[PDB]
C-alpha cells in the first residue's frame, strides 16, 4: 500500500495533494457538541491566471493564462487549525500554522514575469449555516492575509532595503533624490486575498475531504517599487477533519 520517501523522491508526487476515490461521495457528521480541527489542509495549484492591465479602461481586463517557471514548488501543505462549529451550525476554519505560502513566478505571453506569494496565511473560512454533515455540497469561503513577497531585510541590487540597506542611490551621489524616492524608500505591503473551497469528495468514515479551490490575491509589488497584479489561482485541495 504505502509510499516511502524513496518511492516519492524526485517524481513530482511530493508537490501533489492526496486524492480520494470516485467512490468517496459520503457525508461526515458534525456533532455540534464536539470540538474539531483540520489536521492537514493541502492546496495544489494547477493554474495561475493574471489579470492583464489594459490602456483601454474601456472594457474589462481578463485573467490570462501564464507559464509556471519555478517548477514543482507551488503547493501549500501540512496546514492545520481549529474547525469551529458556530451557533448557526456553520463551520469556521481558523488557520493556525503550516507550510502556508510559496513564492511562485509565472510568466505571461511575451516574457513579463509575475512573482507572487501564493498563500492562505491567517485563513478564516466558513461554510453555509446549518452544516450538520460535511457533504459534496459543502463549500468554505473566506479571507487570508498576503504580506509583502519579500520581508523587511531584503536588499535590492543596489543595497537598498527597509530594515537594512542603504537609504539612497549611493552610485549617483549628487542626483536629485525626489525622482528616486519610490525606489529608495522601501514599503512593506499587507493586503487581503479571498478563496473558495468546493468539496467534491467526502469519506464519511475517515473525515477526509477533497475538492477544487479558487483564490484571488495580489502579486509582488517589489517593496513598493511598482503596482502589483491581480492573480487568480485554481487547483485542488485535500483536508482531514478530526475530532480534537
Amino acid at each position: 500500500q504505502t509510499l516511502t520517501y524513496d518511492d516519492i523522491v524526485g517524481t513530482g508526487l511530493a508537490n501533489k495533494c492526496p486524492t480520494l476515490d470516485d467512490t468517496a461521495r459520503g457525508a461526515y457528521p458534525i456533532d455540534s457538541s464536539q470540538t474539531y480541527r483540520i489536521a492537514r489542509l493541502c492546496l495544489q495549484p494547477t493554474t495561475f491566471l493574471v489579470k492583464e492591465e489594459p490602456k483601454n479602461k474601456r472594457q474589462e481586463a481578463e485573467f490570462v493564462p501564464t507559464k509556471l517557471v519555478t517548477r514543482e514548488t507551488t503547493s501549500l501543505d501540512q496546514i492545520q487549525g481549529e474547525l469551529k462549529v458556530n451557533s448557526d451550525g456553520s463551520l469556521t476554519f481558523v488557520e493556525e500554522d503550516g507550510i502556508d505560502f510559496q513564492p511562485v513566478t509565472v510568466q505571461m505571453a511575451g516574457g513579463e514575469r509575475i512573482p507572487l506569494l501564493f498563500t492562505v496565511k491567517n485563513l478564516v473560512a466558513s461554510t453555509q449555516p446549518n452544516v450538520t454533515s460535511i457533504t459534496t455540497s459543502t463549500d468554505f469561503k473566506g479571507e487570508f492575509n498576503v504580506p509583502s513577497y519579500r520581508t523587511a531585510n531584503f536588499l535590492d541590487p543596489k543595497g537598498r532595503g527597509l530594515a537594512s540597506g542603504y537609504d539612497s542611490a549611493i552610485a549617483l551621489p549628487q542626483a536629485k533624490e525626489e525622482e528616486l524616492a519610490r525606489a529608495n524608500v522601501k514599503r512593506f505591503s499587507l493586503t487581503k486575498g479571498q478563496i473558495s473551497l468546493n468539496v467534491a469528495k467526502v469519506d464519511g468514515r475517515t473525515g477526509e475531504i477533497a475538492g477544487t479551490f479558487e483564490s484571488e490575491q495580489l502579486s509582488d509589488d517589489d517593496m513598493g517599487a511598482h503596482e502589483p497584479h491581480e492573480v487568480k489561482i485554481q487547483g485542488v485541495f485535500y483536508a482531514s477533519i478530526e475530532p480534537a
Partner: protein, 56 residues
C-alpha cells in the same frame, strides 16, 4: 510601430511568437517552429549556407 517585415510574415500565416503572444492578441498560442523567431532563424541559417556555397 514602423514594422516593415512583420506584416509580410503575418500575410502568409506567421502570426505567433515562441514567447506566447500572437498578432491577433491571443495568449498561450503555440506557433510551433514557424513563429516569427523561427522564420528569422531559418533565414539566417539559409544565408550562411548560401555564403558557403558561394565560396565553393
Amino acid at each position: 510601430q514602423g514594422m516593415f517585415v512583420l506584416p509580410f510574415m503575418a500575410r502568409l500565416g506567421v502570426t505567433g511568437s515562441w514567447s506566447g503572444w500572437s498578432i491577433t492578441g491571443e495568449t498561450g498560442i503555440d506557433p510551433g517552429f514557424w513563429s516569427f523567431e523561427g522564420v528569422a532563424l531559418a533565414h539566417i541559417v539559409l544565408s550562411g549556407l548560401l555564403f558557403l556555397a558561394a565560396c565553393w
